[PDB]
Design a protein around this nucleic acid. Structure first.
Ligand SMILES: [Mg+2]
Ligand SMILES: [Mg+2]
Ligand SMILES: [Mg+2]
Ligand SMILES: [Mg+2]
Ligand SMILES: [Mg+2]
Ligand SMILES: [Mg+2]
Ligand SMILES: [Mg+2]
Ligand SMILES: [Mg+2]
Ligand SMILES: [Mg+2]
Lengths: 236, 125, 225, 63
RNA sequence: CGUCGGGCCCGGGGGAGGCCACGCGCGCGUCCCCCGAAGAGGGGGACGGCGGAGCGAGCGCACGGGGUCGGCGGCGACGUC
RNA sequence: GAGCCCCGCGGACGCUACGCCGCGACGAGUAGGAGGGCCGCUGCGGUGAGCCUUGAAGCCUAGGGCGCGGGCCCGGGUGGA
């Protein structure tokens, strides 16, 4: 089970040609010439019912729809979103200051921790400072600033997958006719797990940010536009 | 012969129905009820058909026998099946698969029996 | 006898697979040889001029045997003679380019329809880009996109033209089978030239674009495709 | 635009018998399929010979 | 005399890097080398498109014969869709 | 030196051939010519175990739709053979 023995220098092209590959993997010497279950048999269950019942699985359907759709052609591409490769904008590096643009925190400045496996951005702020908790955000809906703080030698707990942030739903279990409205669960409770994780992750970044001056005041502010400056002329 | 009957009746018939951009036909043994040489229920020397049972329960299947081509009285044999969906479906597939009785209308008949039995089953409000 | 039929079928499949990769290797090595050639006349057309200069004398190069023609005028109000010669050249549309072998007869043809066309002598890279990007062939008088070499050898094979580089070699180096391959290619339907052309009526020499340009045909092609 | 004289694009030839003769239609199907699935131009010539009018199918004398 | 010339870069010989879509036998040829005791006969190398006689499979990745997700968010009856 | 499928009994649609499917090119138009019209009106021979006083024709309609179009279908009302 060796590695590919062929470094990709540009995608689709191998660093060596077929003869070099032959030489390197040595097919000059290893040249080789030549060389369930559908039915389970259940016991009898008699008596005088002799003959074990061969019970077949994958039973034939008892109903067939009147028409159908022919199967699609084969696509050879377009893998599901689960294994899409994740691209990161070059301007984004662990520990920069970002600015929120769509969510209910429009204009806030947050700090940027590791990027989630799904491609979403796992960011947070000093909740104590800007009331921004551990929250996912999209790399496309934020503007990257040049202001970078070093966040090396900090620990991001393993239980911070996208599944951890996945929105939870309650409705609607065993309620078909909506006449008694479910007047509970509307207040999304903040479970203690989020609290403890937030506290632990911020405790190690609060002093680090407290070193460089007026970053507290920096992050407390909310970005905005005035009758002067224009975004393209600005340098972020 | 068969192909004659097909072309003489293909566009004029008591059962043919031409309507707003479709065509159908209402022969007693017309699978798919569509005006086709293959699915026509009258011209073929060997023909099938499935219809609901006389009462409100079951499926009847009609087979055109071989010998009585010129005698419509005994040209068909009808048998009603009043078993569950799966066994009846298996039986009717057995008719045409094991008998080679025009093994082209097979799952056409399968679908017609399935839909007939479904419609037969009562509707939940 | 079922296993007998299966081994026979595997025999046929292996034979065809083997023939296929033999053909692939053939066209690979043939393309390598074509590249070795293509370098050669370029290097020469450098070096004899170099050496005549070192001798203080002149080295004229031969007038190219191949030219590319593009039509630059519409179809409204066309004199019958110009219309007919254009129909001869398969330039039935505006921007409907096609290749042509050069001789006295063809040059006189071009002198007839000077204003309705723009032409010149394309180089290798222009030929490659054109034939790859917009290569369409006449098979049973049907314009089919050149997307497979076997599709070529279906009809061009009888003259030994199999792979696409065989067409390129036949075209750039105008060989024995130039006429057949040229007629085989559907005339190239092209876009409109990005950035304009600064005039359409007058001849290229007097600031326009009608007529002949020796090399700027390649700039026009890059802006063209 | 393209300068094609479109008056001659549609070649006029019989695609099928102009009649409604039922047996004729049947053997037209038969020989249509035959000439499609066989490499004998004889079949093609007979096929196209089933189409034209009676004036183009003159009766052959015994002699 | 000159050619970052050609001759599958004709060729050969030698020494403390790169390129090859070059790499089963056995035999038959073609060429080359050794002894050559006829410069005979054997010993070896290189090439072959030459010679009665069956077959790899087993997984993956994809700039590969026309888009999918095995991604997600919000809102809902007397006011809205 | 015979393995004649099968633990199975199994296996999408299709082909009104005057139908369906594939590919390419093309599409202006008076006078004029041709083809199709499941466009339309009236009456006749057949056919729909057609519709109809539990409401036909006809007319009206800010109602719903189809057809590229000729036009058509349905909802609501009036009307009464
Ligand atoms: Mg003009
Ligand atoms: Mg521009
Ligand atoms: Mg003018
Ligand atoms: Mg046009
Ligand atoms: Mg016209
Ligand atoms: Mg050289
Ligand atoms: Mg050499
Ligand atoms: Mg027209
Ligand atoms: Mg009314």
């Amino acid at each position: 089970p060796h590695c590919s023995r062929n470094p990709v220098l540009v995608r689709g092209i191998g660093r060596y040609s077929r003869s070099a590959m032959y030489s390197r993997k040595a097919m000059y010497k290893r040249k080789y010439s030549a060389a369930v279950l559908a039915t389970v048999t259940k016991p009898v269950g008699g008596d005088k019912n002799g003959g074990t019942r061969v019970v077949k699985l994958r039973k034939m359907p008892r109903y067939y729809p009147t028409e159908d759709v022919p199967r699609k052609l084969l696509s050879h591409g377009k893998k599901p979103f689960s294994q899409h490769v994740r691209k990161l904008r070059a301007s984004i590096t662990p520990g920069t200051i970002l600015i929120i643009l769509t969510g209910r925190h429009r204009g806030k400045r947050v700090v940027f921790l590791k990027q989630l496996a799904s491609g979403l951005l796992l960011v947070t702020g000093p909740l104590v400072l800007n009331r921004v908790p551990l929250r996912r955000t999209h790399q496309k809906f934020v503007i990257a600033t040049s202001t970078k703080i070093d966040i090396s030698n900090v620990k991001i707990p393993k239980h911070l997958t996208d599944a951890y942030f996945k929105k939870k739903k309650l409705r609607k279990p065993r309620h078909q006719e909506g006449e008694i409205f479910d007047t509970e669960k509307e207040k999304y409770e903040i479970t203690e797990q989020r609290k403890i994780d937030q506290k632990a992750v911020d405790s190690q970044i609060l002093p680090k940010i407290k070193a460089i001056p007026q970053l507290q005041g920096y992050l407390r502010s909310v970005f905005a536009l005035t009758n002067g400056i224009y975004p393209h002329k600005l340098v972020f | 012969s068969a192909h004659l009957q097909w072309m003489v009746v293909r566009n004029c018939s008591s059962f043919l129905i031409k309507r707003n951009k479709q065509t159908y036909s209402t022969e007693p043994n017309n699978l798919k009820a569509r005006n086709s040489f293959r699915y026509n229920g009258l011209i073929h020397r060997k023909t099938v058909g499935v219809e609901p049972a006389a009462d409100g329960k079951g499926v009847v299947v009609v087979i055109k026998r071989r010998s009585g081509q010129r005698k419509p009285a005994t040209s068909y044999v009808r048998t009603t099946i009043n078993k569950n969906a799966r066994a009846t479906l298996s039986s009717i597939r057995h008719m045409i698969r094991k008998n080679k009785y025009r093994p082209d209308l097979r799952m056409a008949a399968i679908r017609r029996a399935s839909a007939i039995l479904r419609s037969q089953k009562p509707v939940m409000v | 006898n079922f296993a007998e039929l299966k081994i026979k079928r595997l025999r046929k499949k292996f034979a065809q697979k083997m023939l296929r990769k033999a053909r692939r290797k053939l066209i690979y090595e043939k393309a390598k040889h074509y590249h070795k050639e293509y370098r050669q006349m370029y290097r020469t057309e450098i070096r004899m001029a170099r050496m005549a200069r070192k001798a203080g004398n002149f080295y004229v190069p031969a007038e190219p045997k191949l030219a590319f023609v593009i039509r630059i005028r519409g179809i409204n109000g066309v004199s019958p003679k110009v219309r007919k010669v254009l129909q001869l050249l398969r330039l039935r549309q505006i921007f409907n380019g096609t290749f042509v072998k050069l001789n006295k007869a063809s040059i006189n043809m071009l002198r007839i329809v000077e204003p309705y066309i723009a032409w010149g002598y394309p180089n290798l890279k222009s030929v490659n880009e054109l034939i790859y990007k917009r290569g369409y062939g006449k098979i049973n008088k049907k314009r089919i996109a050149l997307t497979d070499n076997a599709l070529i050898a279906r009809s061009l094979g009888k003259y030994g033209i199999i792979c696409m580089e065989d067409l390129i070699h036949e075209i750039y180096t105008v060989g024995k089978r130039f006429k057949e391959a040229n007629n085989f290619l559907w005339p190239f339907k092209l876009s409109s030239p990005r950035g304009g052309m600064k005039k359409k009526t007058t001849h290229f020499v007097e600031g326009g674009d009608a007529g002949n340009r020796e090399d700027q045909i390649n700039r026009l092609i890059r802006r063209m495709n | 635009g393209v300068d094609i004289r479109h008056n001659k694009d549609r070649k006029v030839r019989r695609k099928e018998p102009k009649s409604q003769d039922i047996y004729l239609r049947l053997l037209v199907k038969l020989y249509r399929f035959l000439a499609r699935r066989t490499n004998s131009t004889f079949n093609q010539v007979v096929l196209k010979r089933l189409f034209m009018s009676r004036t183009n199918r003159p009766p052959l004398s015994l002699s």
